[PDB]
Amino acid sequence: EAFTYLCTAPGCATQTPVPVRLAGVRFESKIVDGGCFAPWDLEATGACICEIPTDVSCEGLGAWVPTAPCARIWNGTQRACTFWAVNAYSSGGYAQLASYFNPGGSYYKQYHPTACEVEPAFGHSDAACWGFPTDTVMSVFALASYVQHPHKTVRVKFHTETRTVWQLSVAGVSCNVTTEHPFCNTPHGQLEVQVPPDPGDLVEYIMNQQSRWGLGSPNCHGPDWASPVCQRHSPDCSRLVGATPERPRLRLVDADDPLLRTAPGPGEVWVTPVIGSQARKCGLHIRAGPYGHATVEMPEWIHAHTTSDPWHPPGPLGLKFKTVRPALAPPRNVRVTGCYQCGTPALVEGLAPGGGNCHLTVNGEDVGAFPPGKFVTAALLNTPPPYQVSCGGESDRASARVIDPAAQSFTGVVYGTHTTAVSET
Amino acid sequence: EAFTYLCTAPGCATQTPVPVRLAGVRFESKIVDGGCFAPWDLEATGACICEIPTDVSCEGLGAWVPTAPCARIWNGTQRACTFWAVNAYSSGGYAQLASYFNPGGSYYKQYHPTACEVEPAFGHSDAACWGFPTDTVMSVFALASYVQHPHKTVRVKFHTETRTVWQLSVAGVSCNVTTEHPFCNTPHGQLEVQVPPDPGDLVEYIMNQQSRWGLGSPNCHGPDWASPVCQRHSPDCSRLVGATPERPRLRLVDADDPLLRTAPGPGEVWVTPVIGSQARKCGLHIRAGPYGHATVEMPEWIHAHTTSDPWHPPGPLGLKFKTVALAPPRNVRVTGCYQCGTPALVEGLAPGGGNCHLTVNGEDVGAFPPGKFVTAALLNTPPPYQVSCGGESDRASARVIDPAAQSFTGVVYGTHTTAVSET
Amino acid sequence: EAFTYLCTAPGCATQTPVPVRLAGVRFESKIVDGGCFAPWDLEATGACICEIPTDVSCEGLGAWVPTAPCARIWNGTQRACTFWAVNAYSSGGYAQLASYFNPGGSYYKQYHPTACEVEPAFGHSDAACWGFPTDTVMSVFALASYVQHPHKTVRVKFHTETRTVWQLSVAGVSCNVTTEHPFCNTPHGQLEVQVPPDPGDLVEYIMNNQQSRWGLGSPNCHGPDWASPVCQRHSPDCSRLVGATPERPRLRLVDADDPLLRTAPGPGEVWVTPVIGSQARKCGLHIRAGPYGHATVEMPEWIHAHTTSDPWHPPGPLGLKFKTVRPALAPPRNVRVTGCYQCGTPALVEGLAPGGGNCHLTVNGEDVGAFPPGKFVTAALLNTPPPYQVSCGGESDRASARVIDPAAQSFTGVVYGTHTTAVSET
Ligand SMILES: *[C@@H]1O[C@H](CO)[C@@H](O)[C@H](O)[C@H]1NC(C)=O
Ligand SMILES: *[C@@H]1O[C@H](CO)[C@@H](O)[C@H](O)[C@H]1NC(C)=O
Ligand SMILES: *[C@@H]1O[C@H](CO)[C@@H](O)[C@H](O)[C@H]1NC(C)=O
Ligand SMILES: *[C@@H]1O[C@H](CO)[C@@H](O)[C@H](O)[C@H]1NC(C)=O
Ligand SMILES: *[C@@H]1O[C@H](CO)[C@@H](O)[C@H](O)[C@H]1NC(C)=O
Ligand SMILES: *[C@@H]1O[C@H](CO)[C@@H](O)[C@H](O)[C@H]1NC(C)=O
Ligand SMILES: *[C@@H]1O[C@H](CO)[C@H](O)[C@H](O)[C@H]1NC(C)=O
Ligand SMILES: *[C@@H]1O[C@H](CO)[C@H](O)[C@H](O)[C@H]1NC(C)=O
Ligand SMILES: *[C@@H]1O[C@H](CO)[C@H](O)[C@H](O)[C@H]1NC(C)=O
Ligand SMILES: *[C@@H]1O[C@H](CO)[C@H](O)[C@H](O)[C@H]1NC(C)=O
Ligand code: NA
């Protein structure tokens, strides 16, 4: 027997008793595709209005509310909007008197429907609106939601059962060593490679295509707390699932209100009228408390919280040199059931042929070796259907009922609004 | 030396130099019992009423509100209920005029107590209530809570420090190989088995008794996001702990309100009166936003997100063929918890004659030289504890609590009260 | 070859073929410093007042509200406070009539500003306030927040890539065995030690002088350790809060005979109830609060039961495989270290390894691997702060560094605090 340490860096190589070169470092894993992730981005807009508008919507408020921000925020997740009557019509109009602004504004809404909340704000300062011949007319609109910014959306794949692959060249012969397969054939013997433990789970952040790497689950309780993984989750990059912030809490806060000496809490939006430089016009100052107490800057977060390549321990590898030395037909009636890249092992069943043990592959993925006859195995699959099955020789097409990770995420649940009807007696 | 690969499937066996058969595959772990888990199931009921009821409760509203749903939802977690006066009495009655429905309904509540919120809803459409001799009388009741469905409740045990057990038969002799104990004695010489790494933590979902398996923590951010583990947690299968949704937000939403063009958010319940087919009667349409944006279907979720057996790597195993105190321990004391995830303290006196291969109810906790010993061991068995060095056993002294008791240790459960005195 | 099992307890030793003694057990890890953690402690105070106060603040309500609890709760996280007018002035006063208590109390606030919510509570029982010559005058104040108790605050370091270190004395020579480095030289051979797997991630709870307590795992916030401060309030820099935060407490005025009192308040809910005064123009207040997570955490008790004095390791034994297999360069130059330390993101270490062989590179004594002569680039998880002393096993040199601490890393890639925008007039 012989022994030598092999370093893990590019250029690392040993010469005796048989040369072993470190050709590269890669990894194997059982992928769990989480779909799309993004930060919870609280966005707000509105307008200070020297009028009592009759249509509280983006189109109805087009004369005052910024067009593009209104449309974008209106389409956001957990939308909240409030229309406050600061000083209503003293006479005339159409459902515009102060009496139409009862708490909840049902009287105004009866004649002027809106998806927004309507509230009286009498007693709040109307100083922002000036230049009226008689009484001042003033209202305030606020709109907020959690907007999903495309540039802040990342595709995330969780890597489980991670195995560092130490790509070696043993006297010119390729050998890929892992904790699962640490043996290599040498010209006249066997090489057993002592390897460090695997690094545990990895996080693959995909932006578009470039992949960036995290080490861990991630840990939402540590320095990586602002990871999009810890925030908005969309398995199919369309529909939201799981934990969701409450609808934003909108408040009309006058310029001299002592509340302005404090910061808004997460999800809180405070709006303050600004006196107009023009008659019958006014501005609006907005203060919003971001979810998680901070606004995520995606390129900056990725740059500091990820690496260009997956992490691996420093080594070295222990090369143990020894004088020791250790069915090709396709499998039949193979059926694959479950999901792929999902984290739940799929069921692989079929008939292994004669000649010896079938070293079973499913689209080239090693799922184990089986003696001739019926076999059943639970395998974590990384490839989608169709499935080409082999025992190391010719391949055959397996039968499959396999769903994708997004479909798996929606299996066992009934998505959306749950409705019931209470009948009259 | 000799070498051969042994596959890990049933029927796998090698013949030379010494026959080795794969007898089975099992696992060892340090169990962490989480107690009961269930989905957050938002349930809602109510009624559209062409009257101003004087008793806002399930019994008091029995003439309009469905009986069984009211009683069940009333008993739920984080209950919310609202009674809205759409059109009150114009005259007469008993605390039934519009003036009794001030915001918060304190005037109505003085005469007609209720655990529910009471609010005016004047200005909302009263078209659902018709066939009155003079003015219309109308009210709406909504009730919602997080109901725990017994069929949706699962007992969950987290498996940590998992070790795949490769049960071998080496020339008819049983040998259980793991990453911790990879050696088998043979008369030809010692057999060292190269094994793949362990699979990491497992999740055992228990329904009743059958066990189903998950691989991982679980990951609440991936395809298993709807796992009951990610939702309602009751360590003692009675009291709730940790993360809890807010009380449902009940809203009276008229049939033609533009808000109905959007979906309710999680925990939101929108109630809409339905114009009656009969005089002085009306129906109610309810729209509820489930917690997590979807309703969990337990048998279906378990079927797709779990396996019948714990997962293990495919192998093969590397077979390396090489040519290479029994008295019970005394004064043993066990302190802490079992199946909890915090190592218990095991202390005592190892006897003379050699190293004590210490077992606690058959669980290997290590070997100790003669004399005083102290060890921190993750215990899977409950007290009483039988302690042995490999021979005769003795009864240890124990102060060990169960996983539910551990979950409530270091906390004071329930309402916190304080009294501010007059000066 | 020769083989023997070595137990893992203090004193364990084998004599043949080579003496091997178990000297001790320690651990190596890649530290992730999370900063400060504490339970979410909902605290509440208030007063029942037979008057309409004109200054709703701790100082302004000093005649009724307990001084120290008001000041402490006012400084808490997610503060909520409400002032309810139960029975206002019938005449006179200064912005104290019932008409000043419109919903939201904007009319009262015009003359009597406050950071608190102001609401009418007319119709609620005013029985608690008596002894007035004419009409009763009554108001109620409630104040609640999440107070961070210093004695409940713990510094937490997450330990990743954990490696149990089996400290051995092999024929009198120190050998520290791990899953990464399981070989020891024997007088004229080599010892390969078969070791059990590493225990996975650890949690180090740091209190106060300074004492460390240990958890095994992530932790698991869904199991018996659900009340861990790690599952609660997170402050990376022990000053500013980040991530998940409860909503502002929901304050409710609940009369003594309200059927709602037959139920318990939910998490974050605070119910206040006036208590009839034994003295004229005075009243007490009963407060019922629903703690976050359904329970109040008792820190010394939680730590005592949910942690150990030392990190956990498997019981062993170790497999001693004895074999007959046979048993310092110049410092690196132009070395640069970029990223963070004790953060969980590998830092970039680049430089020039000298000629003469492979450089066994150390960064402040931390092993980062071996590199052939010339340019090298590696991603290493660093546990030590800058400055960085770099070596190939001999003399050391000072590396150039742009390395931030764990608290700075926690705030990198985010813009902290209030986000503002201005909507201009058309
Ligand atoms: C908002 O959503 C509607 C419906 O999906 C779509 O037609 C419209 O273009 C969207 N607007 C923006 C600005 O995203
Ligand atoms: C090792 O991996 C590389 C890259 O996947 C592959 O080309 C090569 O054939 C592999 N070698 C063996 C022996 O499997
Ligand atoms: C509701 O709870 C009460 C008290 O525990 C019990 O008597 C009653 O049977 C329960 N009703 C339902 C429908 O669960
Ligand atoms: C292996 O495990 C089985 C099942 O627990 C047991 O019956 C058998 O005795 C074990 N063999 C040894 C050598 O411990
Ligand atoms: C409250 O905060 C202020 C400002 O930081 C400080 O001066 C005061 O001492 C604090 N009071 C208490 C009781 O913590
Ligand atoms: C083993 O560890 C101890 C403590 O850290 C150290 O003093 C000793 O030098 C180490 N031995 C070797 C061979 O590295
Ligand atoms: C919920 O309501 C919609 C229409 O609003 C559909 O009728 C749906 O079928 C309803 N579901 C149930 C269970 O009644
Ligand atoms: C909490 O209040 C209850 C009554 O509601 C009991 O009196 C209990 O003893 C209280 N404890 C205190 C004073 O915190
Ligand atoms: C937010 O408002 C503050 C003052 O309240 C500052 O003016 C700050 O620059 C504003 N930010 C933006 C982007 O307008
Ligand atoms: C604030 O938001 C408004 C729209 O709501 C405008 O886009 C304005 O320009 C924003 N402020 C800045 C500085 O970007
Ligand atoms: Na006006």
Ligand code: NA
């Ligand atoms: Na009426």
Ligand code: NA
């Ligand atoms: Na009065």
